[PDB]
């Protein structure tokens, strides 16, 4: 249920969906793999929102864009607007809590 | 005057060298980028101090290795030991005044 974002198609990703979340991420970077299963499982729980991941090395221009620098970046997007984020691995609740705010 | 390091060529680095200075950086990241300047000035000023800069896309097993996420990661090393850091782009002040108490 998790999209995999790229240059081409992220603006479409937080346009055509009201409440996103982005998980940006590196291979290298312990915390973010560490994170992934609990974003993944995040995504099943709530099919009202939209997930997707954005690979950091992939899509160089998405990530400079939005001035990323620490990881993981989660990004909360409403209305195609970053409304909030979370640098650095945290639990599932302090995403879910954040979750709830938006829906 | 700085060096590019890799995963085979890391740990002698840090070995041969008594004091070493090591920028974690990855090309996607913009305060990296505008860092990397600075660092090399430095490099210049203080060639009693190892420089070395290790691209995390890389040489992802060093990245792992010392739990690196937040970029830049500016790794200061002494004996082999890591023994501070700076977490982000920094003055070149903040650097310089860190170098001077290594050495």
Redesign the interface.
């Known amino acids: 249920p998790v999209k995999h974002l790229n240059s081409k198609n992220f603006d479409e990703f937080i346009t055509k969906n009201k409440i996103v979340v982005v998980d940006f991420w ?7 793999l560490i994170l992934a299963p609990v974003i993944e499982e995040l995504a099943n729980d709530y099919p009202q929102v939209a997930f997707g991941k954005l690979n ?2 992939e899509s ?1 221009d998405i ?2 864009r939005y ?6 970046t989660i990004m909360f997007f409403k209305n195609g607007e970053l409304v909030d984020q979370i ?3 945290v639990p599932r609740e302090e995403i879910e809590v954040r979750l709830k705010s938006l829906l």
Chains 1, 2 share one sequence.
């Not at 590196?26 to 973010?32: D, G, L, N, R, S």
Request: with cysteine; charged share 10%.
């Open positions: 590196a291979e290298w970077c312990a915390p973010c950091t090395e160089q990530a400079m001035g990323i620098m620490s990881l993981p640098l650095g691995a």
